[PDB]
């Protein structure tokens, strides 16, 4: 792409603030300078429930761009401490007009999207909670800010976020977790847990 | 006027035709002029799942629209007869880089359905198929092709059907349908869901 517009109001949120409220009426799009964010919904009940992360490099807020405008569609969480761009849903149109090369990328992150948003269906539907949870580590495993561990990986997640992707409480994911630990997957640590292999 | 050659390159399927094989390498993209398509994802023993449906007016085959490829990740068959554009990536990408409206058209359209794809996810998870099935009867009978009922609802579904908007089996929703009926929420040819 060429998202090297100077203008950009660039912020900064330390970990576990909030950037997008969902049911939110903004017009304005985001861009990860560095730093990751969760997204979160709601579920049946009002139980909220990670979608999945964003990483450095990703645009968010952008749902509503492309228009009667709508509400925000999910929380955007910063996980670890962000940078981001924020720009106006008319000013970024404007530059689109003059280079469609900043949609395209936009494009190719939704499609992206798309389909992991699918996968998850398809997880949920055919897998159980503890094929649930494998599927997790190891999916996590592979995303970004992932430590390379002499054992395997390190990657930053606790049983209760776990929990929220499953469909599963705290304590029943940590049982599953304890059951992994036994048939050597994972080794769980205060706020990270290493994935073994 | 939808595109340059919007109406140049058609092509009709009958209802349970398949359009898109998932898993296929192919770079073009479709736009419904009339009818219906499913969506839908399988799992490894070829169980059989309803991600969502498309109208008149929806591209789909866009996802590898933006590649500089991939397969596609979902199978797309005609619901109703459909007649559908065929329109190569090239000349959507050369046609869009002269007026990217026609990109913001595709754009809203991939939003739209990545909100609906979102909204499931929260609706499927923390419930099991039991409870699927259940919610799959409930959101049937608020649907508005549904019948209203001297003793509720009464909706026509099949145990097949069920099983492709849950993901189950059909034997497996047969049980769950026949506890239900002594559960006491409904009575199965039609179905009535009594509330
Ligand atoms: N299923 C999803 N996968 C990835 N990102 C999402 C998903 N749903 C919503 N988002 C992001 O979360 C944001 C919430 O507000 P917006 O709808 O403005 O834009 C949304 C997207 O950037
Ligand atoms: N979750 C979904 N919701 C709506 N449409 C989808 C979904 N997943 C895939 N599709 C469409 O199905 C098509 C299958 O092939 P493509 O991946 O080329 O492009 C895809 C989209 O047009
Ligand atoms: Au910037
Ligand atoms: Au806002
Ligand atoms: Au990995
Ligand atoms: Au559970
Ligand atoms: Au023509
Ligand atoms: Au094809
Ligand atoms: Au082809
Ligand atoms: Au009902
Ligand atoms: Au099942
Ligand atoms: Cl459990
Ligand atoms: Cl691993
Ligand atoms: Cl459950
Ligand atoms: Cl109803
Ligand atoms: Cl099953």
Redo the contacts with the bound molecule.
Sequence with gaps: LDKLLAHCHRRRYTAKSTI?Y?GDRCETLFFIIKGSVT?L?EDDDGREMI??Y?NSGD??????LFESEQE?????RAKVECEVAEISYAKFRELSQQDSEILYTLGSQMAD?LR??TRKVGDLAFLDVTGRVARTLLDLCQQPDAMTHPDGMQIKITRQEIGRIVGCSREMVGRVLKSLEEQGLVHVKGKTMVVFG
């Design positions: 997008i969902a997204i919904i979608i999945g964003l645009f968010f807020g952008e749902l509503g925000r569609s999910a929380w955007v999207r992991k948003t």
